[PDB]
Amino acid sequence: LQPVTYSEPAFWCSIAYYELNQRVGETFHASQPSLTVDGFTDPSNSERFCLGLLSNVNRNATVEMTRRHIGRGVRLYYIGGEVFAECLSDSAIFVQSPNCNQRYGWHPATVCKIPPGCNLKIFNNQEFAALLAQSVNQGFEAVYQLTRMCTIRMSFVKGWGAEYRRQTVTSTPCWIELHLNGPLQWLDKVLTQM
Amino acid sequence: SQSPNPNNPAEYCSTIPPLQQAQASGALSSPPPTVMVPVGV
């Protein structure tokens, strides 16, 4: 009935931490533009998701070694719709971002790497916007499919898929999943308009 | 040519601070994206 414009979220993302197949802890809701997810035992705050004291009764040896290596972890930034991931950890962080994959022409399930001291724009809203634009023409179905683009997976030390020993994200010891609430809210407004 | 290789971070990652990548780009001054939506189904 009219255009549906993107709205900057109040909580740009929700982060769920997992240790293999186990969901560990509770969801962190990012309310600030920056936020770090690390392995330290400090109290968490609006900009810090400290995984150091999250207990898991099913924590095995591998997970224990991986957690000791997260260290400073990953710094996530939301800068005007664009989302960046910076490896503060001394170990690399592996990212499975549908948005980057679409951008670099990689297989939808491709997982890349962000080495220490480096960063990657894990989400480009402009690209997602263009993708959404062509999707509204493919009807309701395709538009709802975009829900996949609003999710990012990240492992703290070990990678997965392609020729790595581990193939599914659930196979990595320490990993988190981000839900970009901005894009999701936009999708909801588009879907309700249909 | 083709595209960056997922196995070579140097081809896609950066060491330029994100804020500076946002700058020299857009992200604050860039108006929020808008799509034109119908009304059917």
PDB file of C-alpha atoms in Angstrom:
ATOM      1  CA  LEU A   1       0.000   0.000   0.000  1.00  0.00           C
ATOM      2  CA  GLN A   2       3.157   2.153   0.297  1.00  0.00           C
ATOM      3  CA  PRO A   3       6.939   1.909   0.874  1.00  0.00           C
ATOM      4  CA  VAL A   4       8.419   0.182   3.926  1.00  0.00           C
ATOM      5  CA  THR A   5      11.572   1.858   5.217  1.00  0.00           C
ATOM      6  CA  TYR A   6      14.278   0.425   7.481  1.00  0.00           C
ATOM      7  CA  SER A   7      14.083   1.352  11.166  1.00  0.00           C
ATOM      8  CA  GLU A   8      17.231   1.439  13.327  1.00  0.00           C
ATOM      9  CA  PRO A   9      16.613  -1.086  16.122  1.00  0.00           C
ATOM     10  CA  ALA A  10      16.666  -0.313  19.836  1.00  0.00           C
ATOM     11  CA  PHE A  11      18.532  -3.615  20.331  1.00  0.00           C
ATOM     12  CA  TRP A  12      20.525  -4.185  17.132  1.00  0.00           C
ATOM     13  CA  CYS A  13      21.213  -7.863  17.852  1.00  0.00           C
ATOM     14  CA  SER A  14      20.529 -10.799  20.149  1.00  0.00           C
ATOM     15  CA  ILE A  15      23.441 -13.150  20.727  1.00  0.00           C
ATOM     16  CA  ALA A  16      23.023 -16.768  21.758  1.00  0.00           C
ATOM     17  CA  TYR A  17      26.121 -18.611  22.981  1.00  0.00           C
ATOM     18  CA  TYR A  18      26.577 -22.318  22.379  1.00  0.00           C
ATOM     19  CA  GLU A  19      29.090 -24.998  23.257  1.00  0.00           C
ATOM     20  CA  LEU A  20      28.742 -27.604  20.535  1.00  0.00           C
ATOM     21  CA  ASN A  21      25.065 -28.646  20.517  1.00  0.00           C
ATOM     22  CA  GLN A  22      24.490 -27.040  23.922  1.00  0.00           C
ATOM     23  CA  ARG A  23      22.934 -23.608  24.325  1.00  0.00           C
ATOM     24  CA  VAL A  24      25.008 -22.048  27.092  1.00  0.00           C
ATOM     25  CA  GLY A  25      23.737 -19.147  29.150  1.00  0.00           C
ATOM     26  CA  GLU A  26      21.113 -16.609  28.140  1.00  0.00           C
ATOM     27  CA  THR A  27      20.595 -14.232  25.234  1.00  0.00           C
ATOM     28  CA  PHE A  28      22.582 -11.006  25.198  1.00  0.00           C
ATOM     29  CA  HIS A  29      20.679  -8.100  23.653  1.00  0.00           C
ATOM     30  CA  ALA A  30      22.954  -5.441  22.229  1.00  0.00           C
ATOM     31  CA  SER A  31      21.569  -1.998  23.004  1.00  0.00           C
ATOM     32  CA  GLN A  32      24.795  -0.089  22.232  1.00  0.00           C
ATOM     33  CA  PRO A  33      26.601   0.364  18.884  1.00  0.00           C
ATOM     34  CA  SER A  34      29.651  -1.597  20.098  1.00  0.00           C
ATOM     35  CA  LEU A  35      29.820  -4.800  22.085  1.00  0.00           C
ATOM     36  CA  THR A  36      32.467  -7.384  22.895  1.00  0.00           C
ATOM     37  CA  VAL A  37      31.934 -11.109  23.422  1.00  0.00           C
ATOM     38  CA  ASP A  38      34.903 -12.583  25.288  1.00  0.00           C
ATOM     39  CA  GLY A  39      36.054 -15.468  27.461  1.00  0.00           C
ATOM     40  CA  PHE A  40      36.785 -13.382  30.539  1.00  0.00           C
ATOM     41  CA  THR A  41      35.167 -13.961  33.935  1.00  0.00           C
ATOM     42  CA  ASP A  42      34.239 -10.312  34.395  1.00  0.00           C
ATOM     43  CA  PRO A  43      30.609  -9.298  34.906  1.00  0.00           C
ATOM     44  CA  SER A  44      28.771  -8.726  31.616  1.00  0.00           C
ATOM     45  CA  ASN A  45      27.482  -5.223  30.832  1.00  0.00           C
ATOM     46  CA  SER A  46      25.594  -3.427  28.027  1.00  0.00           C
ATOM     47  CA  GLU A  47      28.714  -3.652  25.853  1.00  0.00           C
ATOM     48  CA  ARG A  48      30.288  -6.834  27.198  1.00  0.00           C
ATOM     49  CA  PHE A  49      29.125 -10.419  26.958  1.00  0.00           C
ATOM     50  CA  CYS A  50      31.542 -12.252  29.261  1.00  0.00           C
ATOM     51  CA  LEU A  51      31.402 -16.005  28.613  1.00  0.00           C
ATOM     52  CA  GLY A  52      34.099 -16.840  31.148  1.00  0.00           C
ATOM     53  CA  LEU A  53      31.739 -17.882  33.946  1.00  0.00           C
ATOM     54  CA  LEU A  54      28.966 -19.484  31.889  1.00  0.00           C
ATOM     55  CA  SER A  55      28.641 -23.015  33.203  1.00  0.00           C
ATOM     56  CA  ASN A  56      27.756 -26.054  31.093  1.00  0.00           C
ATOM     57  CA  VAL A  57      27.351 -29.423  32.809  1.00  0.00           C
ATOM     58  CA  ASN A  58      28.206 -31.042  29.466  1.00  0.00           C
ATOM     59  CA  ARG A  59      31.430 -29.074  28.997  1.00  0.00           C
ATOM     60  CA  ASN A  60      34.103 -31.473  27.770  1.00  0.00           C
ATOM     61  CA  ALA A  61      37.872 -31.058  27.485  1.00  0.00           C
ATOM     62  CA  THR A  62      37.872 -29.648  23.936  1.00  0.00           C
ATOM     63  CA  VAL A  63      35.396 -26.909  24.860  1.00  0.00           C
ATOM     64  CA  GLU A  64      37.470 -26.126  27.964  1.00  0.00           C
ATOM     65  CA  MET A  65      40.605 -25.594  25.876  1.00  0.00           C
ATOM     66  CA  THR A  66      38.765 -23.510  23.268  1.00  0.00           C
ATOM     67  CA  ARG A  67      37.197 -21.261  25.919  1.00  0.00           C
ATOM     68  CA  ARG A  68      40.652 -20.546  27.355  1.00  0.00           C
ATOM     69  CA  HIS A  69      41.607 -19.236  23.919  1.00  0.00           C
ATOM     70  CA  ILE A  70      38.674 -16.889  23.243  1.00  0.00           C
ATOM     71  CA  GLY A  71      40.386 -14.235  25.343  1.00  0.00           C
ATOM     72  CA  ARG A  72      39.318 -10.774  24.174  1.00  0.00           C
ATOM     73  CA  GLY A  73      36.972 -12.464  21.704  1.00  0.00           C
ATOM     74  CA  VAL A  74      35.097 -10.489  19.074  1.00  0.00           C
ATOM     75  CA  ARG A  75      34.094  -6.849  19.009  1.00  0.00           C
ATOM     76  CA  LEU A  76      30.861  -6.310  17.105  1.00  0.00           C
ATOM     77  CA  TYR A  77      29.911  -2.932  15.654  1.00  0.00           C
ATOM     78  CA  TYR A  78      26.642  -1.623  14.252  1.00  0.00           C
ATOM     79  CA  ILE A  79      27.449   1.522  12.269  1.00  0.00           C
ATOM     80  CA  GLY A  80      24.399   2.855  10.462  1.00  0.00           C
ATOM     81  CA  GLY A  81      22.977  -0.533   9.546  1.00  0.00           C
ATOM     82  CA  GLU A  82      26.375  -1.991   8.652  1.00  0.00           C
ATOM     83  CA  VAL A  83      27.672  -4.663  11.028  1.00  0.00           C
ATOM     84  CA  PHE A  84      31.379  -5.324  11.595  1.00  0.00           C
ATOM     85  CA  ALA A  85      33.164  -8.096  13.439  1.00  0.00           C
ATOM     86  CA  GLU A  86      36.675  -7.550  14.743  1.00  0.00           C
ATOM     87  CA  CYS A  87      38.863 -10.335  16.069  1.00  0.00           C
ATOM     88  CA  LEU A  88      40.334  -9.128  19.359  1.00  0.00           C
ATOM     89  CA  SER A  89      41.162 -12.705  20.246  1.00  0.00           C
ATOM     90  CA  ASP A  90      44.686 -14.013  19.738  1.00  0.00           C
ATOM     91  CA  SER A  91      42.998 -16.883  17.917  1.00  0.00           C
ATOM     92  CA  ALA A  92      40.986 -16.282  14.759  1.00  0.00           C
ATOM     93  CA  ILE A  93      37.188 -16.232  14.659  1.00  0.00           C
ATOM     94  CA  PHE A  94      35.334 -18.052  11.886  1.00  0.00           C
ATOM     95  CA  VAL A  95      32.194 -16.428  10.518  1.00  0.00           C
ATOM     96  CA  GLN A  96      29.253 -17.939   8.632  1.00  0.00           C
ATOM     97  CA  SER A  97      27.438 -14.853   7.372  1.00  0.00           C
ATOM     98  CA  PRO A  98      24.796 -15.311   4.678  1.00  0.00           C
ATOM     99  CA  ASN A  99      25.155 -11.602   3.909  1.00  0.00           C
ATOM    100  CA  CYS A 100      28.875 -11.823   3.160  1.00  0.00           C
ATOM    101  CA  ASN A 101      28.356 -15.071   1.281  1.00  0.00           C
ATOM    102  CA  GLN A 102      25.796 -13.400  -0.978  1.00  0.00           C
ATOM    103  CA  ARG A 103      28.236 -10.491  -1.372  1.00  0.00           C
ATOM    104  CA  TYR A 104      31.315 -12.496  -2.306  1.00  0.00           C
ATOM    105  CA  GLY A 105      29.386 -15.015  -4.395  1.00  0.00           C
ATOM    106  CA  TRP A 106      30.222 -17.780  -1.926  1.00  0.00           C
ATOM    107  CA  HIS A 107      28.141 -20.869  -1.274  1.00  0.00           C
ATOM    108  CA  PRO A 108      25.316 -19.847   1.111  1.00  0.00           C
ATOM    109  CA  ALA A 109      26.873 -22.045   3.808  1.00  0.00           C
ATOM    110  CA  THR A 110      30.433 -20.778   3.344  1.00  0.00           C
ATOM    111  CA  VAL A 111      32.340 -19.959   6.540  1.00  0.00           C
ATOM    112  CA  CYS A 112      35.203 -17.459   6.331  1.00  0.00           C
ATOM    113  CA  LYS A 113      37.901 -16.363   8.756  1.00  0.00           C
ATOM    114  CA  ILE A 114      38.685 -13.124  10.587  1.00  0.00           C
ATOM    115  CA  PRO A 115      42.306 -13.261  11.811  1.00  0.00           C
ATOM    116  CA  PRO A 116      43.409 -11.479  15.021  1.00  0.00           C
ATOM    117  CA  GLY A 117      43.481  -7.691  14.755  1.00  0.00           C
ATOM    118  CA  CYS A 118      41.403  -7.810  11.583  1.00  0.00           C
ATOM    119  CA  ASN A 119      37.731  -7.158  10.940  1.00  0.00           C
ATOM    120  CA  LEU A 120      35.071  -7.924   8.375  1.00  0.00           C
ATOM    121  CA  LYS A 121      31.771  -6.265   7.550  1.00  0.00           C
ATOM    122  CA  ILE A 122      29.617  -9.267   8.368  1.00  0.00           C
ATOM    123  CA  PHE A 123      26.462  -7.420   7.284  1.00  0.00           C
ATOM    124  CA  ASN A 124      25.835  -4.795   4.641  1.00  0.00           C
ATOM    125  CA  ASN A 125      22.325  -3.370   4.965  1.00  0.00           C
ATOM    126  CA  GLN A 126      22.500  -1.739   1.510  1.00  0.00           C
ATOM    127  CA  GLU A 127      23.023  -5.154  -0.066  1.00  0.00           C
ATOM    128  CA  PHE A 128      20.306  -6.707   2.073  1.00  0.00           C
ATOM    129  CA  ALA A 129      18.061  -3.812   1.016  1.00  0.00           C
ATOM    130  CA  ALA A 130      18.647  -4.463  -2.694  1.00  0.00           C
ATOM    131  CA  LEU A 131      18.074  -8.181  -2.047  1.00  0.00           C
ATOM    132  CA  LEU A 132      14.833  -7.370  -0.226  1.00  0.00           C
ATOM    133  CA  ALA A 133      13.840  -5.111  -3.113  1.00  0.00           C
ATOM    134  CA  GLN A 134      14.004  -7.930  -5.670  1.00  0.00           C
ATOM    135  CA  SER A 135      12.456 -10.318  -3.128  1.00  0.00           C
ATOM    136  CA  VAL A 136       9.183  -8.377  -2.734  1.00  0.00           C
ATOM    137  CA  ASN A 137       8.718  -9.134  -6.442  1.00  0.00           C
ATOM    138  CA  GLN A 138       9.129 -12.871  -5.845  1.00  0.00           C
ATOM    139  CA  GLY A 139       6.098 -12.784  -3.575  1.00  0.00           C
ATOM    140  CA  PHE A 140       5.628 -13.591   0.095  1.00  0.00           C
ATOM    141  CA  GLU A 141       7.766 -16.743   0.145  1.00  0.00           C
ATOM    142  CA  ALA A 142      11.091 -15.211  -0.951  1.00  0.00           C
ATOM    143  CA  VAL A 143      10.595 -12.190   1.301  1.00  0.00           C
ATOM    144  CA  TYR A 144      10.284 -14.484   4.316  1.00  0.00           C
ATOM    145  CA  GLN A 145      13.367 -16.386   3.126  1.00  0.00           C
ATOM    146  CA  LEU A 146      15.431 -13.318   3.940  1.00  0.00           C
ATOM    147  CA  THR A 147      15.085 -14.289   7.614  1.00  0.00           C
ATOM    148  CA  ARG A 148      18.218 -16.352   6.907  1.00  0.00           C
ATOM    149  CA  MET A 149      20.246 -13.271   5.947  1.00  0.00           C
ATOM    150  CA  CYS A 150      19.584 -11.752   9.367  1.00  0.00           C
ATOM    151  CA  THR A 151      21.557 -14.455  11.124  1.00  0.00           C
ATOM    152  CA  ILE A 152      25.311 -14.858  11.564  1.00  0.00           C
ATOM    153  CA  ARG A 153      27.235 -17.768  13.140  1.00  0.00           C
ATOM    154  CA  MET A 154      30.721 -17.363  14.620  1.00  0.00           C
ATOM    155  CA  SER A 155      33.165 -19.850  16.116  1.00  0.00           C
ATOM    156  CA  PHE A 156      35.927 -18.622  18.420  1.00  0.00           C
ATOM    157  CA  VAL A 157      38.934 -20.776  17.509  1.00  0.00           C
ATOM    158  CA  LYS A 158      37.980 -23.737  15.297  1.00  0.00           C
ATOM    159  CA  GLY A 159      36.282 -23.518  11.916  1.00  0.00           C
ATOM    160  CA  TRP A 160      33.794 -25.829  10.214  1.00  0.00           C
ATOM    161  CA  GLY A 161      32.327 -26.878   6.862  1.00  0.00           C
ATOM    162  CA  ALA A 162      34.146 -26.839   3.515  1.00  0.00           C
ATOM    163  CA  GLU A 163      37.161 -29.050   4.215  1.00  0.00           C
ATOM    164  CA  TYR A 164      37.431 -28.620   7.989  1.00  0.00           C
ATOM    165  CA  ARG A 165      37.078 -31.708  10.168  1.00  0.00           C
ATOM    166  CA  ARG A 166      33.906 -30.238  11.719  1.00  0.00           C
ATOM    167  CA  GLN A 167      31.103 -29.754   9.191  1.00  0.00           C
ATOM    168  CA  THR A 168      28.187 -28.216  11.093  1.00  0.00           C
ATOM    169  CA  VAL A 169      28.406 -25.217  13.424  1.00  0.00           C
ATOM    170  CA  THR A 170      27.159 -27.459  16.252  1.00  0.00           C
ATOM    171  CA  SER A 171      30.448 -29.313  15.884  1.00  0.00           C
ATOM    172  CA  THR A 172      32.582 -26.374  17.062  1.00  0.00           C
ATOM    173  CA  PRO A 173      33.341 -26.003  20.802  1.00  0.00           C
ATOM    174  CA  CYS A 174      32.580 -22.310  21.258  1.00  0.00           C
ATOM    175  CA  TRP A 175      30.267 -20.457  18.934  1.00  0.00           C
ATOM    176  CA  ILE A 176      27.650 -17.724  19.025  1.00  0.00           C
ATOM    177  CA  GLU A 177      24.718 -16.808  16.804  1.00  0.00           C
ATOM    178  CA  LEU A 178      23.669 -13.214  16.107  1.00  0.00           C
ATOM    179  CA  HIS A 179      20.183 -12.135  15.109  1.00  0.00           C
ATOM    180  CA  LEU A 180      20.213  -8.732  13.470  1.00  0.00           C
ATOM    181  CA  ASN A 181      16.995  -7.275  14.851  1.00  0.00           C
ATOM    182  CA  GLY A 182      17.127  -4.254  12.567  1.00  0.00           C
ATOM    183  CA  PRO A 183      16.783  -6.300   9.324  1.00  0.00           C
ATOM    184  CA  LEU A 184      14.286  -8.670  10.994  1.00  0.00           C
ATOM    185  CA  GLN A 185      12.030  -5.790  12.091  1.00  0.00           C
ATOM    186  CA  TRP A 186      12.202  -4.453   8.538  1.00  0.00           C
ATOM    187  CA  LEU A 187      11.200  -7.861   7.194  1.00  0.00           C
ATOM    188  CA  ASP A 188       8.265  -7.938   9.603  1.00  0.00           C
ATOM    189  CA  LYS A 189       7.019  -4.537   8.363  1.00  0.00           C
ATOM    190  CA  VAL A 190       7.376  -5.703   4.749  1.00  0.00           C
ATOM    191  CA  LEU A 191       5.563  -8.991   5.443  1.00  0.00           C
ATOM    192  CA  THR A 192       2.717  -7.252   7.307  1.00  0.00           C
ATOM    193  CA  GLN A 193       2.425  -4.906   4.310  1.00  0.00           C
ATOM    194  CA  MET A 194       1.805  -8.053   2.260  1.00  0.00           C
TER     195      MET A 194
ATOM    196  CA  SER B   1      38.507 -12.049 -12.529  1.00  0.00           C
ATOM    197  CA  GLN B   2      36.284 -13.842  -9.990  1.00  0.00           C
ATOM    198  CA  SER B   3      35.854 -13.115  -6.251  1.00  0.00           C
ATOM    199  CA  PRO B   4      37.825 -13.375  -2.963  1.00  0.00           C
ATOM    200  CA  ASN B   5      38.732 -16.797  -1.592  1.00  0.00           C
ATOM    201  CA  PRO B   6      37.126 -17.713   1.803  1.00  0.00           C
ATOM    202  CA  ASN B   7      40.457 -19.298   2.698  1.00  0.00           C
ATOM    203  CA  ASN B   8      42.485 -16.127   2.237  1.00  0.00           C
ATOM    204  CA  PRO B   9      41.356 -13.488   4.802  1.00  0.00           C
ATOM    205  CA  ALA B  10      43.622 -10.880   3.185  1.00  0.00           C
ATOM    206  CA  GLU B  11      41.252 -10.841   0.220  1.00  0.00           C
ATOM    207  CA  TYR B  12      38.186  -9.755   2.214  1.00  0.00           C
ATOM    208  CA  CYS B  13      39.121  -8.694   5.770  1.00  0.00           C
ATOM    209  CA  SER B  14      40.730  -5.408   6.772  1.00  0.00           C
ATOM    210  CA  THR B  15      42.691  -3.749   9.556  1.00  0.00           C
ATOM    211  CA  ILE B  16      41.134  -0.334   8.944  1.00  0.00           C
ATOM    212  CA  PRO B  17      39.005   0.586  11.975  1.00  0.00           C
ATOM    213  CA  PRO B  18      35.315  -0.138  11.240  1.00  0.00           C
ATOM    214  CA  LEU B  19      34.315   3.455  12.077  1.00  0.00           C
ATOM    215  CA  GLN B  20      36.707   4.661   9.366  1.00  0.00           C
ATOM    216  CA  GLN B  21      35.299   2.126   6.913  1.00  0.00           C
ATOM    217  CA  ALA B  22      31.800   3.412   7.754  1.00  0.00           C
ATOM    218  CA  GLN B  23      33.240   6.872   7.117  1.00  0.00           C
ATOM    219  CA  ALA B  24      34.614   7.309   3.577  1.00  0.00           C
ATOM    220  CA  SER B  25      31.582   5.237   2.816  1.00  0.00           C
ATOM    221  CA  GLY B  26      28.266   6.338   4.310  1.00  0.00           C
ATOM    222  CA  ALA B  27      26.695   4.606   7.301  1.00  0.00           C
ATOM    223  CA  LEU B  28      25.975   7.755   9.247  1.00  0.00           C
ATOM    224  CA  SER B  29      24.806  10.197   6.545  1.00  0.00           C
ATOM    225  CA  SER B  30      23.278   7.444   4.394  1.00  0.00           C
ATOM    226  CA  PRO B  31      19.437   7.547   4.612  1.00  0.00           C
ATOM    227  CA  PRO B  32      17.751   4.305   5.775  1.00  0.00           C
ATOM    228  CA  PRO B  33      16.928   1.921   2.879  1.00  0.00           C
ATOM    229  CA  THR B  34      13.333   1.793   1.647  1.00  0.00           C
ATOM    230  CA  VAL B  35      11.598  -0.862  -0.442  1.00  0.00           C
ATOM    231  CA  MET B  36       8.257  -0.537  -2.203  1.00  0.00           C
ATOM    232  CA  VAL B  37       5.836  -3.152  -0.897  1.00  0.00           C
ATOM    233  CA  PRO B  38       2.505  -4.263  -2.488  1.00  0.00           C
ATOM    234  CA  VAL B  39      -0.365  -5.732  -0.402  1.00  0.00           C
ATOM    235  CA  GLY B  40      -1.350  -9.210  -1.510  1.00  0.00           C
ATOM    236  CA  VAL B  41      -1.601 -12.700   0.059  1.00  0.00           C
TER     237      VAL B  41
END
